[PDB]
Design a protein around this ligand. Structure first.
Ligand SMILES: [Zn+2]
Ligand SMILES: [Zn+2]
Ligand SMILES: [Zn+2]
Ligand SMILES: [Zn+2]
Ligand SMILES: [Zn+2]
Ligand SMILES: [Zn+2]
Lengths: 118, 118, 118
């Protein structure tokens, strides 16, 4: 891909901004001093973490459905378990989208995703 | 633009040499250790200084014309004031040319321009 | 030339790996922290050292052939002198190959060559 501001290849990844950028972006005062990595290397790095969180979330979801079934203030526990199961469902959806997308789609905003997991 | 020595894009600016260069030029022993910036950032920086110097030079020119008019060894002061008015006349033209030109045309040799102002 | 891993130009030279690489290779964890130079400058630098070592090795070889001829445990000295003359023959051949080859072929493994000279 190519940068909107500069038109150069998007091969670097800024951690603080959690945003893909080119070298010229790295040298500007906007991203000056930040820590920047190679897009491919960080892509391999985060892909594993989001996959792991995907398996963990799937297990937790199966357990949540089992618990919700067995429950059938038990009603309150059922409701809260339902809302939680929904939130997890959406999270899993986003993780699958990122894992099947391009490296840029995966990295852009990964900080927010990992914050959401925790 | 493209580099004569290397053929790469001219996107960096070396302060010590006050010359626009590419990354390969930055990494050579010729410009090794110098401080280099992004052409756009230093372009915005110097544009303001040459604009300010433009206003200042215009004021000094108006005042010079007023003084020369009122003078009309006062004659010697008239002649010298005339020569000065000529030099400034050229300087203002150069400042407008640079300010209305591209970033490269503005930065190339700006050191000599600012040296001329002072 | 172009990089196998990344497809970018091979314009840099890693001293530790004594290997020509592109910028992306420089920023990977593989070559992170290493000392990297411009390929052309180090090529011009090493060309002179291998040329000097070439002349020196040629002189030493002529002297070695003269000594081996004059020898005709002197026999043991003849044998060892012969083996040495062979090793030098191969070294000189490699030096000529590198000096007439491309910058990459010259630099790739130059550390091993200079170690072989000594
Ligand atoms: Zn950019
Ligand atoms: Zn940044
Ligand atoms: Zn250059
Ligand atoms: Zn310089
Ligand atoms: Zn590479
Ligand atoms: Zn290396």
């Amino acid at each position: 891909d190519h940068c909107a501001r500069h038109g150069e290849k998007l091969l670097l990844f800024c951690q603080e901004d959690s945003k893909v950028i080119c070298w010229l972006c790295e040298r500007s005062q906007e991203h000056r001093g930040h820590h920047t990595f190679l897009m491919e290397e960080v892509a391999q790095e985060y892909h594993v973490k989001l996959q792991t969180a995907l398996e963990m979330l799937r297990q937790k979801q199966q357990e949540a459905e089992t618990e919700r079934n067995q429950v059938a203030a038990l009603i309150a526990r059922g409701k809260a378990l339902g809302e939680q199961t929904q939130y997890m469902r959406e999270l899993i959806s986003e993780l699958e989208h990122r894992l099947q997308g391009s490296m840029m789609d995966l990295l852009q905003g990964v900080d927010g995703i990992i914050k959401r997991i925790e």
